[PDB]
Amino acid sequence: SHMASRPILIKNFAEHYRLMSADSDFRFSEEFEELKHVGRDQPCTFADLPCNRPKNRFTNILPYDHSRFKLQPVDDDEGSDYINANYVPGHNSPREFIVTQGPLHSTRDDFWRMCWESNSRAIVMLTRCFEKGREKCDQYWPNDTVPVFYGDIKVQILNDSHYADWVMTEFMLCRGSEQRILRHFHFTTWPDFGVPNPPQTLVRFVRAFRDRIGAEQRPIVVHCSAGVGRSGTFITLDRILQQINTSDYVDIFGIVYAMRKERVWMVQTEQQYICIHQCLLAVLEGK
Numbered sequence: 001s002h003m004a005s006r007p008i009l010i011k012n013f014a015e016h017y018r019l020m021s022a023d024s025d026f027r028f029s030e031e032f033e034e035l036k037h038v039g040r041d042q043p044c045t046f047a048d049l050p051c052n053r054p055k056n057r058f059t060n061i062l063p064y065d066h067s068r069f070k071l072q073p074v075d076d077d078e079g080s081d082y083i084n085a086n087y088v089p090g091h092n093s094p095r096e097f098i099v100t101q102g103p104l105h106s107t108r109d110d111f112w113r114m115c116w117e118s119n120s121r122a123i124v125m126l127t128r129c130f131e132k133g134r135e136k137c138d139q140y141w142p143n144d145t146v147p148v149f150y151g152d153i154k155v156q157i158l159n160d161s162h163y164a165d166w167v168m169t170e171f172m173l174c175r176g177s178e179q180r181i182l183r184h185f186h187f188t189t190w191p192d193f194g195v196p197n198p199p200q201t202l203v204r205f206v207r208a209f210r211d212r213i214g215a216e217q218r219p220i221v222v223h224c225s226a227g228v229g230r231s232g233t234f235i236t237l238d239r240i241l242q243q244i245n246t247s248d249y250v251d252i253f254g255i256v257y258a259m260r261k262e263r264v265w266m267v268q269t270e271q272q273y274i275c276i277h278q279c280l281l282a283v284l285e286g287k
Contacts, residue, residue, distance in 0.1 A: 006031065006253035010244055010284065017281050025274060031253065032270045038260035042066060051079040055110070057101045061226040067262045069098050071113055083110050084227065086263035090235060091242040092215060099222040099231045099263060102127055102137025109151035111140055115182065115221055116153050116175055122213050123221040125186040126230040132192050136225040141169065141184065152176075165189040165201045166208065185209045190230060195275040200287055203279050206238045229268025232259060236267060236276050241283065252276055 001007075008016045020028045046052055047062035056062060062084070063069075069085035083100065084107075090096030098118055102125075103111040115123065129137050142148045147156035154174040158181070161168050169184040187205050189196065196202045213220065224230035236259070240250050256273065259266035267273050 004254060004257045005251055007249040007251040010248060010250060013250065013284050014281060017277055020277065021274070025270070028274050028277070029270055032267075032273045035253075035256055035260055035267075038257055039064065039262070039264065040260075042261075046079065046082050047084070049079050049082070051077075052082045055079075055082055055104075055107050056084055057104060058226050061101065061228060061264060064263060069100070069114055069118065071110060072117060083107065083114055085114060087219070088222075088235060088262045088266065089258050090220075091239040093217070095219060096216075097222050097235055098219045099227045099235070099266075101227045102129075102223050102225045103140045105138045108138055108140040109153075112150040112153040112155065112173075116173065116180075118221070119218045120221045121180065121182050121218055122209075122216060123182065123184045123223070124209065124231075124234060125184065125223055126190060126234055127224040128188060128190075137223070141171070163208075166205050168208075168212070183212065185212075187234075195233070195271055198282075199275055199279045200282055202233070202237065202275075203241075203283060203287075206234065206241060206279075210238055210241065226265070228263065228265035229272055232256070232266035232268060233272045233276060235259065237279055240276070240280055244280075244283070250280065252280075 042064045044062040045065050046068065047056060063086045067086045069083055069087060070081045071083055074080040085098050085100035087095045088097040088099045098120065127136050129135060129139050142155060142157050145157050147154050152175055156172045158170040158172050165187060167186045167188060171182045171184060173180040173182050189201060222231045222235060236252060236255050239255055240252060243250055256267045
């Protein structure tokens with residue numbers, strides 16, 4: 001099993017890392033290059049419908065038709081089923097994650113409807129709203145305790161908890177007389193360029209998140225800006241940290257491959273692919 005899987009004995013990971021990164025990441029680079037076409041020959045029909053094009057943050061980041069998340073149709077709209085979202089597999093379910101773009105003001109009603117309709121209880125945000133002066137994501141949630149309606153979804157902060165690299169916010173979600181609690185895990189520290197360094201701040205966040213959420217059976221919403229690179233990095237990382245618990249092997253390659261099949265650019269860059277490896281190496285070495 002060699003085309004879409006490169007499993008490594010956990011007992012050998014450190015050497016694998018060494019070997020993989022030797023010669024200015026020759027083998028890592030080569031490995032990652034094999035993923036560049038995966039998934040890409042699949043249709044994105046609805047993402048291209050003239051009524052949906054304003055719903056995409058980036059023209060070149062579009063959901064595959066086969067895995068896209070669909071909103072309930074609204075009887076006059078047309079593409080009112082549409083969102084830039086895709087089901088992406090995790091450790092626990094082939095549909096464990098719904099990964100999406102950072103909402104535009106234009107789409108934050110859509111975004112909360114997705115949360116609601118998906119029955120998701122947890123959002124993972126891996127970006128700042130503004131980075132280097134560019135806006136990367138609308139502020140789709142309240143700044144304070146005054147509830148705010150987004151579409152038919154009333155969102156209210158119950159409490160928040162600030163940390164060195166993340167803030168977690170417990171929302172109460174009401175739709176009609178129907179009530180849920182949702183937790184929002186906001187990693188606020190990803191650097192303006194490159195990957196987090198040292199990588200450990202991201203492991204600590206993945207640990208906190210997973211320790212908090214438990215073995216969720218409902219889809220977890222994940223996003224950054226395009227919902228591909230940073231989101232890809234996070235999921236892979238959360239997956240392999242669960243994997244090592246019950247297995248003898250890890251398969252970062254096999255995981256990224258599965259993800260590409262479900263949404264474009266899932267682990268986006270060679271630097272992040274390497275990062276995933278480094279994070280796990282820290283873990284396996286007692287940080």
